[PDB]
Design a protein around this nucleic acid. Structure first.
Length: 125
RNA sequence: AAACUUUCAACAACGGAUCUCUUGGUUCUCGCAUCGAUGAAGAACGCAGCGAAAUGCGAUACGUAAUGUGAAUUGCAGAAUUCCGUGAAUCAUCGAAUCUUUGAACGCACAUUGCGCCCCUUGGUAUUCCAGGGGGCAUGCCUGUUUGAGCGUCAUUU
Protein backbone atom coordinates (compact mmCIF):
# COMPACT_ATOMS: atom_id res chain seq x y z
CA UNK A 1 0.00 0.00 0.00
CA UNK A 2 1.00 3.64 -0.43
CA UNK A 3 2.10 5.77 2.51
CA UNK A 4 3.10 9.19 1.16
CA UNK A 5 0.48 11.88 0.63
CA UNK A 6 1.73 13.07 -2.78
CA UNK A 7 0.99 9.64 -4.29
CA UNK A 8 -2.59 9.35 -5.54
CA UNK A 9 -4.31 5.97 -5.88
CA UNK A 10 -7.25 7.46 -7.80
CA UNK A 11 -8.13 5.58 -10.98
CA UNK A 12 -9.41 8.67 -12.78
CA UNK A 13 -6.27 10.70 -12.05
CA UNK A 14 -3.89 7.87 -12.93
CA UNK A 15 -5.69 7.13 -16.20
CA UNK A 16 -5.71 10.80 -17.18
CA UNK A 17 -2.01 11.14 -16.38
CA UNK A 18 -1.24 8.09 -18.51
CA UNK A 19 -3.34 9.16 -21.49
CA UNK A 20 -2.16 12.79 -21.39
CA UNK A 21 1.50 12.08 -20.63
CA UNK A 22 3.89 13.97 -22.93
CA UNK A 23 6.43 12.17 -25.12
CA UNK A 24 9.21 12.42 -22.53
CA UNK A 25 7.09 10.54 -19.97
CA UNK A 26 5.80 8.13 -22.62
CA UNK A 27 9.44 7.16 -23.19
CA UNK A 28 9.64 5.86 -19.61
CA UNK A 29 6.12 4.40 -19.85
CA UNK A 30 7.20 2.40 -22.93
CA UNK A 31 10.01 0.61 -21.08
CA UNK A 32 10.73 -2.98 -22.09
CA UNK A 33 12.40 -5.82 -20.15
CA UNK A 34 15.75 -7.25 -21.16
CA UNK A 35 16.08 -10.92 -22.03
CA UNK A 36 17.50 -13.34 -19.48
CA UNK A 37 20.86 -13.24 -21.30
CA UNK A 38 20.94 -9.43 -21.42
CA UNK A 39 19.79 -9.17 -17.80
CA UNK A 40 22.67 -11.46 -16.81
CA UNK A 41 25.09 -9.45 -18.97
CA UNK A 42 24.17 -5.96 -17.78
CA UNK A 43 22.44 -6.26 -14.42
CA UNK A 44 19.40 -4.33 -15.68
CA UNK A 45 15.84 -5.60 -15.31
CA UNK A 46 14.30 -3.25 -17.89
CA UNK A 47 15.11 -0.16 -19.95
CA UNK A 48 13.18 2.47 -21.89
CA UNK A 49 12.92 1.06 -25.40
CA UNK A 50 14.73 2.74 -28.30
CA UNK A 51 14.55 2.84 -32.09
CA UNK A 52 17.29 0.33 -33.02
CA UNK A 53 16.89 -2.20 -30.19
CA UNK A 54 16.67 -5.81 -31.34
CA UNK A 55 13.55 -7.19 -29.67
CA UNK A 56 11.81 -10.55 -29.28
CA UNK A 57 8.06 -10.94 -28.75
CA UNK A 58 7.17 -13.04 -25.69
CA UNK A 59 3.38 -12.55 -25.64
CA UNK A 60 0.64 -12.40 -28.26
CA UNK A 61 -0.02 -13.93 -31.66
CA UNK A 62 3.62 -13.27 -32.65
CA UNK A 63 5.32 -15.06 -29.76
CA UNK A 64 8.91 -15.95 -30.58
CA UNK A 65 9.14 -13.33 -33.35
CA UNK A 66 12.47 -11.51 -33.54
CA UNK A 67 13.15 -8.13 -35.04
CA UNK A 68 14.83 -4.75 -34.80
CA UNK A 69 12.60 -1.86 -33.77
CA UNK A 70 11.50 0.36 -36.65
CA UNK A 71 9.85 3.11 -34.60
CA UNK A 72 8.71 3.97 -31.09
CA UNK A 73 5.22 5.35 -31.73
CA UNK A 74 4.84 7.14 -28.40
CA UNK A 75 1.62 8.78 -29.60
CA UNK A 76 0.08 5.34 -30.16
CA UNK A 77 1.83 3.89 -27.07
CA UNK A 78 3.46 1.20 -29.18
CA UNK A 79 6.57 0.08 -31.04
CA UNK A 80 6.90 -0.94 -34.68
CA UNK A 81 9.29 -3.81 -35.45
CA UNK A 82 10.60 -4.80 -38.87
CA UNK A 83 9.26 -8.06 -40.37
CA UNK A 84 6.48 -7.94 -37.76
CA UNK A 85 3.81 -6.78 -40.20
CA UNK A 86 0.45 -7.69 -41.70
CA UNK A 87 -0.04 -8.31 -45.42
CA UNK A 88 -3.27 -6.60 -46.44
CA UNK A 89 -5.46 -8.19 -49.10
CA UNK A 90 -4.26 -5.61 -51.65
CA UNK A 91 -0.68 -6.79 -51.05
CA UNK A 92 0.61 -3.83 -49.02
CA UNK A 93 2.51 -4.69 -45.84
CA UNK A 94 1.43 -2.54 -42.88
CA UNK A 95 3.21 -2.33 -39.52
CA UNK A 96 1.59 -4.05 -36.55
CA UNK A 97 1.96 -2.27 -33.23
CA UNK A 98 2.63 -3.99 -29.94
CA UNK A 99 3.39 -2.87 -26.42
CA UNK A 100 7.03 -3.09 -25.27
CA UNK A 101 5.83 -4.69 -22.02
CA UNK A 102 5.02 -7.74 -24.18
CA UNK A 103 8.55 -7.77 -25.61
CA UNK A 104 12.01 -8.73 -24.42
CA UNK A 105 15.10 -6.73 -25.37
CA UNK A 106 17.67 -9.06 -26.95
CA UNK A 107 20.25 -6.55 -28.22
CA UNK A 108 20.71 -2.96 -27.05
CA UNK A 109 21.48 -0.02 -29.30
CA UNK A 110 24.26 1.46 -27.18
CA UNK A 111 25.52 5.02 -27.38
CA UNK A 112 27.18 7.24 -24.78
CA UNK A 113 23.84 8.06 -23.15
CA UNK A 114 22.60 4.45 -23.13
CA UNK A 115 25.83 3.24 -21.53
CA UNK A 116 25.72 6.08 -18.98
CA UNK A 117 22.12 5.19 -18.13
CA UNK A 118 23.16 1.54 -17.74
CA UNK A 119 25.87 2.53 -15.25
CA UNK A 120 23.34 4.80 -13.53
CA UNK A 121 20.79 2.00 -13.10
CA UNK A 122 23.63 -0.21 -11.87
CA UNK A 123 24.92 -2.02 -14.94
CA UNK A 124 28.52 -2.80 -15.78
CA UNK A 125 28.59 -3.82 -19.49
C1' A B 1 -62.17 -18.86 -50.34
C1' A B 2 -58.72 -14.21 -51.25
C1' A B 3 -57.56 -8.83 -50.37
C1' C B 4 -58.08 -6.08 -46.10
C1' U B 5 -58.07 -5.66 -40.38
C1' U B 6 -56.43 -7.50 -35.68
C1' U B 7 -53.17 -10.99 -32.40
C1' C B 8 -48.51 -13.81 -31.85
C1' A B 9 -43.69 -15.61 -33.32
C1' A B 10 -39.26 -15.64 -36.59
C1' C B 11 -36.22 -12.74 -39.68
C1' A B 12 -35.59 -7.98 -41.57
C1' A B 13 -36.74 -2.48 -40.67
C1' C B 14 -35.88 4.81 -38.75
C1' G B 15 -35.50 4.37 -33.14
C1' G B 16 -31.48 4.86 -29.89
C1' A B 17 -33.80 2.60 -24.45
C1' U B 18 -31.28 -0.95 -21.44
C1' C B 19 -26.56 -3.13 -19.90
C1' U B 20 -21.32 -2.41 -19.33
C1' C B 21 -17.91 1.44 -19.81
C1' U B 22 -15.73 6.81 -18.49
C1' U B 23 -9.09 11.56 -19.74
C1' G B 24 -16.09 14.62 -17.27
C1' G B 25 -18.71 16.73 -13.40
C1' U B 26 -20.10 17.64 -8.20
C1' U B 27 -19.12 17.84 -2.96
C1' C B 28 -15.38 17.47 1.11
C1' U B 29 -10.41 18.26 2.78
C1' C B 30 -5.19 20.13 2.84
C1' G B 31 -1.43 23.64 1.15
C1' C B 32 -0.17 28.52 -1.19
C1' A B 33 -0.55 33.92 -2.33
C1' U B 34 1.05 35.53 -7.68
C1' C B 35 -2.85 40.60 -12.42
C1' G B 36 -1.99 45.78 -14.48
C1' A B 37 0.98 52.50 -17.37
C1' U B 38 7.89 47.62 -17.32
C1' G B 39 0.67 48.23 -20.53
C1' A B 40 -3.34 43.74 -17.49
C1' A B 41 -8.01 41.04 -18.28
C1' G B 42 -10.54 41.20 -22.85
C1' A B 43 -10.95 42.12 -28.32
C1' A B 44 -9.46 42.00 -33.56
C1' C B 45 -6.42 40.35 -37.49
C1' G B 46 -2.90 37.13 -38.75
C1' C B 47 1.28 32.80 -38.23
C1' A B 48 1.80 25.58 -39.77
C1' G B 49 4.98 22.16 -46.04
C1' C B 50 -0.27 20.59 -46.65
C1' G B 51 -5.42 24.06 -41.17
C1' A B 52 -10.25 28.38 -39.42
C1' A B 53 -11.61 27.11 -33.88
C1' A B 54 -10.85 27.49 -25.01
C1' U B 55 -4.05 24.22 -29.41
C1' G B 56 -0.05 27.37 -29.33
C1' C B 57 1.96 31.82 -30.90
C1' G B 58 2.84 37.39 -32.99
C1' A B 59 5.77 39.78 -39.11
C1' U B 60 11.81 36.35 -34.75
C1' A B 61 4.17 34.42 -35.57
C1' C B 62 1.86 26.11 -34.38
C1' G B 63 7.11 29.75 -32.62
C1' U B 64 13.28 32.12 -31.30
C1' A B 65 16.97 31.91 -27.13
C1' A B 66 18.75 29.32 -22.38
C1' U B 67 18.33 24.57 -19.57
C1' G B 68 17.16 19.26 -18.83
C1' U B 69 16.38 14.67 -21.15
C1' G B 70 18.40 11.69 -24.66
C1' A B 71 16.33 9.71 -30.56
C1' A B 72 12.32 11.30 -32.20
C1' U B 73 7.78 13.70 -35.02
C1' U B 74 4.07 10.85 -37.57
C1' G B 75 -2.14 11.69 -41.33
C1' C B 76 1.06 12.18 -45.65
C1' A B 77 5.53 14.40 -47.26
C1' G B 78 10.33 16.51 -46.35
C1' A B 79 15.90 20.39 -45.47
C1' A B 80 19.67 16.89 -42.92
C1' U B 81 24.85 12.13 -40.80
C1' U B 82 19.86 15.53 -36.95
C1' C B 83 22.30 9.80 -33.72
C1' C B 84 29.21 7.23 -28.90
C1' G B 85 26.04 13.80 -29.85
C1' U B 86 26.74 21.31 -27.52
C1' G B 87 21.95 16.60 -29.96
C1' A B 88 15.56 14.56 -32.61
C1' A B 89 11.22 15.89 -30.27
C1' U B 90 3.47 18.66 -31.41
C1' C B 91 9.25 16.50 -25.25
C1' A B 92 9.86 18.72 -20.59
C1' U B 93 11.73 23.01 -18.12
C1' C B 94 11.76 28.11 -18.73
C1' G B 95 15.15 32.80 -15.88
C1' A B 96 16.79 35.63 -22.37
C1' A B 97 13.86 37.83 -26.14
C1' U B 98 10.09 38.89 -29.96
C1' C B 99 5.36 40.26 -28.63
C1' U B 100 0.92 42.94 -35.19
C1' U B 101 -3.86 46.31 -34.48
C1' U B 102 -6.05 47.39 -29.97
C1' G B 103 -7.76 47.49 -25.05
C1' A B 104 -7.51 51.25 -18.10
C1' A B 105 -5.14 52.77 -23.55
C1' C B 106 -1.79 57.73 -23.43
C1' G B 107 -0.36 63.12 -29.67
C1' C B 108 -5.85 64.64 -31.56
C1' A B 109 -9.61 61.45 -33.43
C1' C B 110 -11.80 56.74 -34.26
C1' A B 111 -19.06 53.75 -38.07
C1' U B 112 -12.25 56.86 -40.74
C1' U B 113 -6.75 51.15 -40.89
C1' G B 114 -8.45 59.66 -40.55
C1' C B 115 -5.36 64.06 -39.24
C1' G B 116 -1.29 66.47 -36.90
C1' C B 117 3.24 68.36 -34.15
C1' C B 118 8.65 67.67 -32.40
C1' C B 119 13.89 65.56 -32.85
C1' C B 120 17.92 62.65 -35.78
C1' U B 121 19.18 59.94 -40.50
C1' U B 122 18.61 58.89 -45.78
C1' G B 123 16.61 60.31 -50.98
C1' G B 124 14.68 63.91 -54.14
C1' U B 125 20.82 69.72 -56.75
C1' A B 126 15.76 71.10 -49.53
C1' U B 127 15.67 74.43 -41.96
C1' U B 128 10.52 75.22 -44.57
C1' C B 129 7.95 70.70 -49.54
C1' C B 130 7.45 65.46 -50.32
C1' A B 131 8.93 60.62 -49.15
C1' G B 132 11.52 56.58 -46.23
C1' G B 133 14.05 54.60 -41.38
C1' G B 134 14.25 55.42 -36.06
C1' G B 135 12.68 58.01 -31.39
C1' G B 136 8.77 60.74 -29.24
C1' C B 137 4.12 64.43 -27.78
C1' A B 138 -2.50 61.92 -22.45
C1' U B 139 -4.74 63.43 -17.70
C1' G B 140 -4.93 64.06 -12.21
C1' C B 141 -1.31 64.18 -8.26
C1' C B 142 3.65 64.14 -5.42
C1' U B 143 8.88 65.64 -4.75
C1' G B 144 12.52 68.38 -7.01
C1' U B 145 14.51 71.88 -11.58
C1' U B 146 14.03 76.03 -14.51
C1' U B 147 11.41 80.11 -16.28
C1' G B 148 7.70 83.46 -14.45
C1' A B 149 3.19 86.44 -12.45
C1' G B 150 0.75 89.42 -8.55
C1' C B 151 1.69 97.37 -4.80
C1' G B 152 0.19 90.13 -1.56
C1' U B 153 4.69 92.01 0.30
C1' C B 154 10.44 92.86 2.57
C1' A B 155 16.13 95.83 2.36
C1' U B 156 17.94 101.71 -2.09
C1' U B 157 15.10 106.29 -4.03
C1' U B 158 13.81 114.64 -5.88
Amino acid sequence: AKQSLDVSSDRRKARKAYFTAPSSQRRVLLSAPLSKELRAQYGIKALPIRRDDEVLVVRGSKKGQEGKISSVYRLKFAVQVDKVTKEKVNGASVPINLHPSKLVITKLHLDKDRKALIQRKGGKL
